[PDB]
Design an enzyme around this catalytic site. Structure first.
Site, PDB file in Angstrom:
ATOM      1  N   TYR A 116      13.359  -2.811   4.511  1.00  0.00           N
ATOM      2  CA  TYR A 116      14.678  -3.926   3.859  1.00  0.00           C
ATOM      3  C   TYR A 116      13.888  -5.649   4.411  1.00  0.00           C
ATOM      4  N   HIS A 140       8.838   7.496  -5.919  1.00  0.00           N
ATOM      5  CA  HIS A 140      10.028   5.959  -5.582  1.00  0.00           C
ATOM      6  C   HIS A 140       9.385   4.856  -4.878  1.00  0.00           C
ATOM      7  N   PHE A 141       8.869   5.227  -3.439  1.00  0.00           N
ATOM      8  CA  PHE A 141       8.067   4.543  -3.036  1.00  0.00           C
ATOM      9  C   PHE A 141       7.146   3.473  -3.595  1.00  0.00           C
ATOM     10  N   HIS A 142       6.166   3.736  -4.440  1.00  0.00           N
ATOM     11  CA  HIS A 142       5.396   3.028  -4.680  1.00  0.00           C
ATOM     12  C   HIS A 142       5.800   2.184  -5.721  1.00  0.00           C
ATOM     13  N   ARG A 147       4.268  16.644  -0.929  1.00  0.00           N
ATOM     14  CA  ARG A 147       3.727  15.288  -0.466  1.00  0.00           C
ATOM     15  C   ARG A 147       2.579  15.422   0.661  1.00  0.00           C
ATOM     16  N   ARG A 148       1.912  14.660   1.105  1.00  0.00           N
ATOM     17  CA  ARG A 148       0.697  14.464   2.424  1.00  0.00           C
ATOM     18  C   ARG A 148       0.101  15.520   1.973  1.00  0.00           C
ATOM     19  N   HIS A 186      14.509   3.184   8.098  1.00  0.00           N
ATOM     20  CA  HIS A 186      15.014   2.407   7.226  1.00  0.00           C
ATOM     21  C   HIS A 186      14.676   0.995   7.311  1.00  0.00           C
TER      22      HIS A 186
HETATM   23  C1  HAS Z   1       9.976  -1.614  -0.531  1.00  0.00           C
HETATM   24  C2  HAS Z   1      10.394  -0.887   0.519  1.00  0.00           C
HETATM   25  C3  HAS Z   1      11.717   0.573  -0.725  1.00  0.00           C
HETATM   26  C4  HAS Z   1      12.857   0.150  -0.882  1.00  0.00           C
HETATM   27  C5  HAS Z   1      13.197  -1.063  -1.424  1.00  0.00           C
HETATM   28  C6  HAS Z   1      13.615   1.429  -0.734  1.00  0.00           C
HETATM   29  C7  HAS Z   1      15.303   1.451  -1.617  1.00  0.00           C
HETATM   30  C8  HAS Z   1      16.134   2.403  -1.637  1.00  0.00           C
HETATM   31  N1  HAS Z   1      15.718   4.066  -0.707  1.00  0.00           N
HETATM   32 FE1  HAS Z   1      13.864   4.577  -0.770  1.00  0.00          FE
HETATM   33  N2  HAS Z   1      14.487   6.010   0.451  1.00  0.00           N
HETATM   34  C9  HAS Z   1      15.567   6.312   0.411  1.00  0.00           C
HETATM   35  C10 HAS Z   1      17.433   5.870  -0.305  1.00  0.00           C
HETATM   36  C11 HAS Z   1      16.441   4.394  -0.859  1.00  0.00           C
HETATM   37  C12 HAS Z   1      18.155   3.943  -1.726  1.00  0.00           C
HETATM   38  C13 HAS Z   1      18.997   4.140  -1.600  1.00  0.00           C
HETATM   39  C14 HAS Z   1      18.106   2.745  -1.651  1.00  0.00           C
HETATM   40  C15 HAS Z   1      18.127   1.145  -2.037  1.00  0.00           C
HETATM   41  O1  HAS Z   1      17.855  -0.156  -1.810  1.00  0.00           O
HETATM   42  C16 HAS Z   1      17.947   0.932  -3.929  1.00  0.00           C
HETATM   43  C17 HAS Z   1      18.677  -0.292  -4.664  1.00  0.00           C
HETATM   44  C18 HAS Z   1      17.624  -0.976  -6.048  1.00  0.00           C
HETATM   45  C19 HAS Z   1      18.801  -0.427  -7.259  1.00  0.00           C
HETATM   46  C20 HAS Z   1      20.511  -0.518  -7.216  1.00  0.00           C
HETATM   47  C21 HAS Z   1      17.655  -1.226  -7.809  1.00  0.00           C
HETATM   48  C22 HAS Z   1      18.111  -2.836  -8.799  1.00  0.00           C
HETATM   49  C23 HAS Z   1      17.644  -3.742  -9.740  1.00  0.00           C
HETATM   50  C24 HAS Z   1      17.210  -4.686  -9.692  1.00  0.00           C
HETATM   51  C25 HAS Z   1      16.785  -5.306  -8.511  1.00  0.00           C
HETATM   52  C26 HAS Z   1      15.964  -4.901 -10.751  1.00  0.00           C
HETATM   53  C27 HAS Z   1      16.930  -5.352 -11.529  1.00  0.00           C
HETATM   54  C28 HAS Z   1      15.556  -6.113 -12.953  1.00  0.00           C
HETATM   55  C29 HAS Z   1      14.523  -7.430 -13.773  1.00  0.00           C
HETATM   56  C30 HAS Z   1      16.140  -8.599 -12.939  1.00  0.00           C
HETATM   57  C31 HAS Z   1      14.083  -7.714 -14.295  1.00  0.00           C
HETATM   58  C32 HAS Z   1      14.379  -8.565 -15.877  1.00  0.00           C
HETATM   59  C33 HAS Z   1      13.979  -9.004 -16.297  1.00  0.00           C
HETATM   60  C34 HAS Z   1      13.507  -8.647 -17.960  1.00  0.00           C
HETATM   61  C35 HAS Z   1      12.366  -9.672 -18.718  1.00  0.00           C
HETATM   62  C36 HAS Z   1      14.657  -8.498 -18.619  1.00  0.00           C
HETATM   63  C37 HAS Z   1      16.002   7.464   1.440  1.00  0.00           C
HETATM   64  C38 HAS Z   1      17.744   8.844   0.884  1.00  0.00           C
HETATM   65  O2  HAS Z   1      18.422   7.972   1.356  1.00  0.00           O
HETATM   66  C39 HAS Z   1      14.757   7.965   1.197  1.00  0.00           C
HETATM   67  C40 HAS Z   1      14.309   9.761   1.646  1.00  0.00           C
HETATM   68  C41 HAS Z   1      13.825  10.725   1.079  1.00  0.00           C
HETATM   69  C42 HAS Z   1      13.390  12.087   1.277  1.00  0.00           C
HETATM   70  O3  HAS Z   1      14.065  13.247   1.510  1.00  0.00           O
HETATM   71  O4  HAS Z   1      12.177  11.436   2.083  1.00  0.00           O
HETATM   72  C43 HAS Z   1      14.274   7.065   0.610  1.00  0.00           C
HETATM   73  C44 HAS Z   1      12.234   7.447   0.619  1.00  0.00           C
HETATM   74  C45 HAS Z   1      11.200   6.450   1.063  1.00  0.00           C
HETATM   75  C46 HAS Z   1       9.841   5.702   1.676  1.00  0.00           C
HETATM   76  C47 HAS Z   1       8.726   7.382   2.405  1.00  0.00           C
HETATM   77  C48 HAS Z   1       9.661   7.434   3.840  1.00  0.00           C
HETATM   78  C49 HAS Z   1       8.799   7.556   4.391  1.00  0.00           C
HETATM   79  O5  HAS Z   1       7.210   7.858   4.753  1.00  0.00           O
HETATM   80  O6  HAS Z   1       9.034   9.478   4.720  1.00  0.00           O
HETATM   81  C50 HAS Z   1       9.798   4.532   1.475  1.00  0.00           C
HETATM   82  C51 HAS Z   1       8.331   4.188   2.097  1.00  0.00           C
HETATM   83  C52 HAS Z   1      10.917   4.069   0.444  1.00  0.00           C
HETATM   84  C53 HAS Z   1      10.694   2.205   0.613  1.00  0.00           C
HETATM   85  C54 HAS Z   1      12.174   1.541  -0.278  1.00  0.00           C
HETATM   86  N3  HAS Z   1      13.377   2.139  -0.910  1.00  0.00           N
HETATM   87  N4  HAS Z   1      12.129   4.617   0.586  1.00  0.00           N
HETATM   88  C1  HEM Z   2      -4.414   1.730  -5.852  1.00  0.00           C
HETATM   89  C2  HEM Z   2      -2.986   0.660  -4.850  1.00  0.00           C
HETATM   90  C3  HEM Z   2      -2.074   2.597  -4.365  1.00  0.00           C
HETATM   91  C4  HEM Z   2      -2.883   3.770  -4.777  1.00  0.00           C
HETATM   92  C5  HEM Z   2      -3.703   4.638  -5.607  1.00  0.00           C
HETATM   93  C6  HEM Z   2      -1.749   4.684  -4.294  1.00  0.00           C
HETATM   94  C7  HEM Z   2      -2.097   6.078  -4.055  1.00  0.00           C
HETATM   95  C8  HEM Z   2      -0.255   6.662  -2.666  1.00  0.00           C
HETATM   96  C9  HEM Z   2      -0.631   7.935  -3.237  1.00  0.00           C
HETATM   97  C10 HEM Z   2      -1.651   9.261  -4.218  1.00  0.00           C
HETATM   98  C11 HEM Z   2      -0.275   8.256  -2.402  1.00  0.00           C
HETATM   99  C12 HEM Z   2       0.476  10.093  -1.440  1.00  0.00           C
HETATM  100  C13 HEM Z   2      -0.595  10.776  -0.812  1.00  0.00           C
HETATM  101  C14 HEM Z   2       0.191  11.884  -0.003  1.00  0.00           C
HETATM  102  O1  HEM Z   2       1.405  11.935  -0.344  1.00  0.00           O
HETATM  103  O2  HEM Z   2      -0.319  12.975   0.179  1.00  0.00           O
HETATM  104  C15 HEM Z   2       0.036   7.484  -1.418  1.00  0.00           C
HETATM  105  C16 HEM Z   2       0.998   7.072  -0.040  1.00  0.00           C
HETATM  106  C17 HEM Z   2       1.081   5.960   0.238  1.00  0.00           C
HETATM  107  N1  HEM Z   2       1.313   4.816   0.073  1.00  0.00           N
HETATM  108 FE1  HEM Z   2      -0.120   4.365  -1.316  1.00  0.00          FE
HETATM  109  N2  HEM Z   2      -1.038   4.121  -2.871  1.00  0.00           N
HETATM  110  C18 HEM Z   2      -1.879   2.603  -3.236  1.00  0.00           C
HETATM  111  C19 HEM Z   2      -0.674   1.499  -2.766  1.00  0.00           C
HETATM  112  C20 HEM Z   2      -0.064   1.614  -1.951  1.00  0.00           C
HETATM  113  C21 HEM Z   2       0.688   0.242  -1.267  1.00  0.00           C
HETATM  114  C22 HEM Z   2       0.182  -1.129  -1.546  1.00  0.00           C
HETATM  115  C23 HEM Z   2       1.571   0.777  -0.593  1.00  0.00           C
HETATM  116  C24 HEM Z   2       2.214  -0.133   0.183  1.00  0.00           C
HETATM  117  C25 HEM Z   2       2.083  -1.533  -0.139  1.00  0.00           C
HETATM  118  C26 HEM Z   2       1.243   1.802  -0.444  1.00  0.00           C
HETATM  119  C27 HEM Z   2       2.183   2.997   0.412  1.00  0.00           C
HETATM  120  C28 HEM Z   2       1.501   4.296   0.679  1.00  0.00           C
HETATM  121  C29 HEM Z   2       2.313   5.237   1.670  1.00  0.00           C
HETATM  122  C30 HEM Z   2       3.444   3.620   2.775  1.00  0.00           C
HETATM  123  C31 HEM Z   2       2.704   6.464   1.385  1.00  0.00           C
HETATM  124  C32 HEM Z   2       2.518   7.273   2.029  1.00  0.00           C
HETATM  125  C33 HEM Z   2       1.843   8.232   2.870  1.00  0.00           C
HETATM  126  C34 HEM Z   2       2.045   9.171   3.946  1.00  0.00           C
HETATM  127  O3  HEM Z   2       2.692   9.579   3.417  1.00  0.00           O
HETATM  128  O4  HEM Z   2       1.945   9.538   5.551  1.00  0.00           O
HETATM  129  N3  HEM Z   2       0.790   1.951  -1.470  1.00  0.00           N
HETATM  130  N4  HEM Z   2      -0.219   6.349  -2.038  1.00  0.00           N
HETATM  131 CL   LIG Z   3      16.861  -2.601  -2.683  1.00  0.00          CL
HETATM  132 CL   LIG Z   4      14.061   4.011   2.624  1.00  0.00          CL
HETATM  133 CU   LIG Z   5      15.462   4.767   3.738  1.00  0.00          CU
END
Ligand code: HAS
Ligand code: HEM
Ligand SMILES: [Cl-]
Ligand SMILES: [Cl-]
Ligand SMILES: [Cu+2]
Ligand SMILES: CCCCCCCC/C=C\CCCCCCCC(=O)OC[C@H](O)CO
Ligand SMILES: CCCCCCCC/C=C\CCCCCCCC(=O)OC[C@H](O)CO
Ligand SMILES: CCCCCCCC/C=C\CCCCCCCC(=O)OC[C@H](O)CO
Ligand SMILES: CCCCCCCC/C=C\CCCCCCCC(=O)OC[C@H](O)CO
Ligand SMILES: CCCCCCCC/C=C\CCCCCCCC(=O)OC[C@H](O)CO
Ligand SMILES: CCCCCCCC/C=C\CCCCCCCC(=O)OC[C@H](O)CO
Ligand SMILES: CCCCCCCC/C=C\CCCCCCCC(=O)OC[C@H](O)CO
Ligand SMILES: CCCCCCCC/C=C\CCCCCCCC(=O)OC[C@H](O)CO
Ligand SMILES: CCCCCCCC/C=C\CCCCCCCC(=O)OC[C@H](O)CO
Ligand SMILES: CCCCCCCC/C=C\CCCCCCCC(=O)OC[C@H](O)CO
Ligand SMILES: CCCCCCCC/C=C\CCCCCCCC(=O)OC[C@H](O)CO
Ligand SMILES: CCCCCCCC/C=C\CCCCCCCC(=O)OC[C@H](O)CO
Ligand SMILES: CCCCCCCC/C=C\CCCCCCCC(=O)OC[C@H](O)CO
Ligand code: CUA
Lengths: 167, 31, 554
Positions: free
Chosen positions: C229, C376-378, C441-442, C225
């Site tokens: 962050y 989500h994570f992309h 996935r995967r 997790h």
């Molecule tokens: C950088 C990477 C990541 C962040 C950040 C992230 C945030 C969250 N995630 Fe996630 N996630 C999960 C829950 C959360 C929650 C509660 C948050 C929170 O921290 C997010 C809070 C965010 C917000 C409340 C959004 C605030 C919006 C903002 C700050 C933008 C405002 C816009 C502006 C200011 C633009 C305005 C500009 C103008 C011009 C109008 C959960 C479960 O509870 C799973 C597991 C699900 C499963 O079944 O596998 C999960 C799975 C993943 C995995 C897959 C792991 C794997 O490979 O199995 C990755 C890599 C990942 C990355 C990230 N995740 N997450």
């Molecule tokens: C051209 C840019 C990208 C494309 C088109 C892309 C596409 C994808 C797709 C389609 C999957 C799903 C594959 C599957 O579940 O079998 C995947 C998995 C993933 N991608 Fe990307 N991806 C890109 C860039 C990135 C970048 C920049 C990151 C991180 C900074 C990222 C992190 C991951 C991760 C962590 C997974 C999961 C691997 C796993 O399940 O073991 N990707 N991507």
């Molecule tokens: Cl966040």
């Molecule tokens: Cl997460």
């Molecule tokens: Cu997490």
């Protein structure tokens, strides 16, 4: 003046946003707690550790004969000993009656597999050495597909099974 | 008042609710 | 340069950044192929003719995950969260240590790369036992990550020298951010370090026959997790303390920025059971506790959304924008360094919404291990974090090298950033929707082309994302090498101050800021919270170990 006034208003409204944010998150917690008090919660795995030996599970015990995997354990309850393995599920099909509570007890002899029953909330990881126990009642008869949704090797994409729910 | 920021968090709130209640409905339909 | 004799940290920072971009490029090559696959198009034959070492979809996905999500992101975090604090304090980091951290990362990367490229560790970036990689994968990954312990030491050193020279002053903002970030990462990192030292390395080396898969996964997600962050908070550092200046504005609250980071320190680590909702042998009460704590860890980003939005609005009003949308039009949309994180933050809206769903225990059974999760994570890491890093090409690289950005390079960068953003949004639609249709996935699903007929429409989105992101990536490669290997040098770019924002005028602060600066105290709190959230489960699992044999099913 400009900045002081902007600063003051920004902070007052931000506090409102945060209280509101919190309220909405707390309401989600209440709505989750509701799910936990209903029958839909059956799909949560049992938290009890139930260890097995993945190397003898096909030779001895309740996974060894898949034609005896379905056991009536109550008046309207069936226990099903499922093996997830590279790359399939036994028995195949799993055959159960609709309207009955089904207790799935799933393990693996090799690596981690998923057990995702399409159209249902059954979605549980299957660990070698451990029994995953989940419960569900099929309300609609017919054939449900089991998808492996955990990468288990090169056969992952073709690892499916079948549940037949009898009218 | 910060009208622009409030509009952003309105979009964020709507998105969160659509996502959350949408999946909640799917969860019960599959129950 | 006499710039590098006076500021040797510039060169080390550059080396982290370039190494990270290189990893980004290599892992990303696999992305378009994976997107086409989730579009039910098999283009792997082409890839294996281009890259003949590639034996499978899954070897590709391993390289993708490791190189993009583990390697690039860490290197970016080490660059930003050492160099920005160093420049704010105008102090030199320990240069022996800083170079040690780079060489540790480099060597670990090379050592892990070798089995990966030879098809000996096709276990994915989560490496869940009993899938059993080559020992050089775990050892190299171990050394790579441990590089960060040296980074932590370096920044605590800087902070303590600064407080020794300035007793009775509050920690400056960027340095405050970095200190709590690195301390958070220390606590966080312990899961994986335990997993590697107690289980994976002895096992991969032959010293034990088996590993208990439940305990491995539990320790994994202790780290797993907060590692997201750790990926996120360098981009937040830029978004809070640099982007407001590039927008034309100011940070609207120093204390609200500090508070977001402090909550990250307290809440990032004790939440990992939200990756184990579908796991046997963990108590459902503990799952509900971690769910609740996961929704709390959303709060600092909910706060960030408002603090940042309000700073951008303020910026746009300063630049003459009026009404409810005029402030948007008024911002510097001509500047890629501005655009890249702002687009990141827009996709973070659906990205965070997806996260909150995922967090909600029972709702996770709808989406767990489906294409939803990569959707989500992309939006989170492959869009917001990556785009913020790409933006840094246009302000940070000139500051480190003196290499200028031509008008043409600026325009190209605008194109890259837009196409990357658009690609990620499109793919996120494809993956979320296929996810809701139960597509796993995967999975190499283009090899079972009739398995998911109902996902035909979202599959089109995936194809389109695949080709858009291939264009974006090729342009990014061209742009990066254009800037690096450029003829010209203008050293005054390397001598300019970083574009740190000012903080808007207004009182209200001091008491809250002082309490938050009790860093030793908040660190102890974070660790206690970890002991309570994890200790009872881990005490139970360690007393009931069930090690099982290893498999190589590739
Ligand atoms: C950088 C990477 C990541 C962040 C950040 C992230 C945030 C969250 N995630 Fe996630 N996630 C999960 C829950 C959360 C929650 C509660 C948050 C929170 O921290 C997010 C809070 C965010 C917000 C409340 C959004 C605030 C919006 C903002 C700050 C933008 C405002 C816009 C502006 C200011 C633009 C305005 C500009 C103008 C011009 C109008 C959960 C479960 O509870 C799973 C597991 C699900 C499963 O079944 O596998 C999960 C799975 C993943 C995995 C897959 C792991 C794997 O490979 O199995 C990755 C890599 C990942 C990355 C990230 N995740 N997450
Ligand atoms: C051209 C840019 C990208 C494309 C088109 C892309 C596409 C994808 C797709 C389609 C999957 C799903 C594959 C599957 O579940 O079998 C995947 C998995 C993933 N991608 Fe990307 N991806 C890109 C860039 C990135 C970048 C920049 C990151 C991180 C900074 C990222 C992190 C991951 C991760 C962590 C997974 C999961 C691997 C796993 O399940 O073991 N990707 N991507
Ligand atoms: Cl966040
Ligand atoms: Cl997460
Ligand atoms: Cu997490
Ligand atoms: C079901 C409902 C869904 C609908 C969601 C809409 C967004 C909700 C709240 C935004 C934050 C509230 C901000 C207002 C608080 C008032 C405030 O703080 O203003 C006082 C200040 O003194 C004045 O100058
Ligand atoms: C100022 C206002 C203060 C008061 C604001 C209160 C917020 C109300 C929101 C949600 C309550 C949750 C309702 C709990 C019942 C849910 C039932 C349900 O979802 O039922 C679906 C399913 O078909 C059955 O199994
Ligand atoms: C751009 C960013 C990416 C955007 C992500 C796409 C997903 C969008 C919203 C999810 C909302 C849930 C969708 C499902 C709602 C269906 C519903 O309401 O189902 C009722 C019925 O009872 C059950 O079958
Ligand atoms: C984004 C588009 C959202 C796609 C909506 C899918 C609806 C769905 O999956 O329905 C839930 C349930 O499985 C049906 O019984
Ligand atoms: C294995 C051997 C790695 C040993 C690497 C030896 C080179 C280390 C030199 C160093 O610290 O590099 C300084 C920097 O590249 C310019 O100032
Ligand atoms: C960079 C980190 C390197 C650390 C590696 C630990 C290597 C393992 C060595 C520790 C000794 C383990 C051992 O001897 O295990 C015996 C066990 O009892 C069998 O039954
Ligand atoms: C400096 C690096 C040293 C690590 C060298 C360690 C080399 C140890 C090789 C052990 C090995 O290959 O054992 C695999 C085992 O037989 C199957 O799990
Ligand atoms: C901050 C800390 C917050 C503290 C919150 C306490 C949560 C309590 C109860 C959850 C019980 C859930 C168990 C119900 C499901 C039982 C089941 O189906 O087990 C299989
Ligand atoms: C699925 C596909 C989703 C596509 C989303 C687009 C978001 C873009 C919104 C951001 C708008 C900024 C544009 C802008 O204001 O540009 C100013 C310029 O000076 C001229 O008006
Ligand atoms: C009808 C929808 C069909 C899907 C479109 C497919 C995707 C990309 C098309 C090209 C988009 C490229 C946009 C580039 C915008 C740009 O560079 O904007 C700079 C501007 O100055 C503000 O920052
Ligand atoms: C803008 C670019 C593309 C729009 C994408 C729209 C997607 C078109 C879906 C067509 C399709 O593939 O449908 C298959 C089948 O007929 C199911 O009804
Ligand atoms: C613009 C969109 C371009 C995407 C082209 C992809 C074509 C495709 O995959 O076609 C699917 C079709 O529904 C069955 O053959
Ligand atoms: C000099 C760096 C050495 C780091 C050793 C202790 C770091 C630590 O835990 O610091 C807590 C906090 O900084 C309270 O001052
Ligand atoms: Cu079994 Cu994937």
């Amino acid at each position: 003046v400009d900045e002081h006034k902007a600063h003051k208003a920004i902070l007052a409204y931000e506090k409102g946003w945060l209280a509101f944010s919190l309220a909405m998150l707390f309401v989600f917690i209440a709505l989750i707690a509701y799910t936990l008090a209903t029958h839909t919660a059956g799909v949560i795995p049992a938290g009890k550790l139930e260890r097995v030996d993945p190397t003898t599970v096909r030779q001895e015990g309740p996974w060894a004969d898949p034609a005896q995997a379905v056991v009536q354990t109550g008046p309207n309850q069936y226990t099903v000993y499922v093996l997830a393995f590279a790359f399939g599920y036994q028995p195949n099909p799993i055959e159960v009656p609709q309207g009955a509570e089904i207790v799935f007890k799933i393990t693996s002899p090799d690596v981690i597999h998923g057990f995702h029953v399409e159209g249902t909330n059954i979605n549980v990881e299957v660990l070698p050495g451990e029994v995953s126990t989940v419960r569900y009642t099929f309300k609609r008869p017919g054939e449900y597909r089991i998808i492996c949704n955990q990468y288990c090797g090169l056969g992952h994409q073709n690892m499916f099974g079948t549940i037949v729910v009898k009218e | 008042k910060p009208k622009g920021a409030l509009a952003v968090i309105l979009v964020l709130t709507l998105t969160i609710l659509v996502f959350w209640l949408g999946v909640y409905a799917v969860f019960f339909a599959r129950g | 340069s006499r710039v590098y004799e006076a500021y040797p940290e510039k060169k080390a920072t550059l080396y982290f950044l370039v190494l990270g971009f290189l990893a980004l490029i290599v892992g990303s090559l696999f992305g378009p192929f994976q997107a086409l696959n989730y579009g039910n198009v098999d283009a792997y034959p082409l890839l294996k003719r281009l890259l003949p070492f590639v034996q499978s979809y899954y070897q590709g996905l391993t390289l993708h995950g490791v190189l993009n999500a583990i390697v690039f992101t860490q290197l970016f975090a080490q660059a930003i969260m050492v160099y920005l604090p160093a420049r704010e304090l105008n102090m030199r980091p320990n240069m022996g240590l800083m170079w040690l951290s780079w060489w540790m990362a480099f060597i670990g990367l090379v050592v892990a790369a070798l089995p990966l490229l030879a098809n000996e560790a096709t276990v994915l970036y989560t490496f869940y036992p009993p899938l059993k990689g080559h020992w050089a994968f775990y050892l190299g990954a171990s050394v790579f990550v441990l590089s960060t312990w040296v980074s932590i030491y370096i920044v605590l050193d800087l902070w303590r020298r600064w407080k020794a020279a300035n007793p009775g002053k509050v920690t400056p903002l960027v340095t405050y951010m970095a200190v709590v970030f690195w301390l958070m990462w220390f606590l966080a990192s312990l899961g994986l370090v335990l997993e590697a030292v107690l289980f994976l390395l002895p096992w991969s080396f032959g010293l034990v026959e088996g590993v208990d898969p439940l305990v491995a996964r539990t320790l994994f997600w202790w780290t797993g997790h907060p590692i997201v962050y750790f990926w996120l908070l360098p981009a937040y550092a830029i978004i809070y303390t640099i982007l407001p200046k590039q927008a034309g504005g100011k940070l609207v609250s120093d204390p609200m920025a500090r508070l977001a980071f402090l909550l990250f320190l307290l809440l990032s680590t004790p939440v990992g059971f939200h990756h184990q909702f579908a796991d046997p042998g963990i108590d459902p009460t503990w799952k509900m506790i971690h769910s609740v704590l996961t929704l709390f860890v959303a709060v600092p980003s909910l706060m960030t959304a408002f603090t940042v939005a309000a700073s951008l609005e303020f910026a746009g009003r300063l630049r003459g924008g009026r009404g409810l949308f005029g402030w948007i039009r008024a911002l510097p949309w001509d500047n890629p360094a501005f655009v890249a994180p702002v687009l990141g933050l827009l996709g973070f809206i659906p990205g965070g919404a997806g996260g909150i769903v995922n967090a909600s225990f029972t709702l996770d059974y709808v989406v767990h291990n489906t294409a939803w999760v990569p959707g989500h994570f992309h939006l989170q890491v492959a869009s917001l974090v990556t785009l913020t890093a790409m933006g840094s090409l246009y302000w940070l690289l000139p500051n480190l090298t003196g290499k200028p950005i031509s008008d043409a390079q600026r325009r190209l960068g605008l194109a890259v950033v837009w196409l990357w953003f658009l690609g990620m949004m499109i793919m996120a639609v494809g993956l979320h929707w296929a996810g809701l249709l139960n597509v796993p996935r995967r999975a190499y699903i283009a090899q079972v082309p009739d398995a998911y007929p109902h996902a035909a429409v979202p599959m089109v989105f995936n194809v389109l994302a695949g080709i858009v992101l291939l264009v974006a990536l090729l342009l990014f490669i061209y742009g990066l090498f254009s800037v690096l290997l450029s003829r010209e040098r203008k050293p005054e770019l390397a001598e300019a101050p970083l574009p740190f924002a000012e903080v808007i005028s207004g009182p209200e602060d001091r008491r809250l800021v002082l309490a938050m600066d009790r860093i030793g105290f908040w660190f102890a709190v974070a660790a206690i919270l970890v002991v309570l959230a994890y200790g009872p489960t881990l005490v139970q699992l360690f007393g009931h170990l069930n090690p099982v044999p290893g498999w190589r099913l590739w």
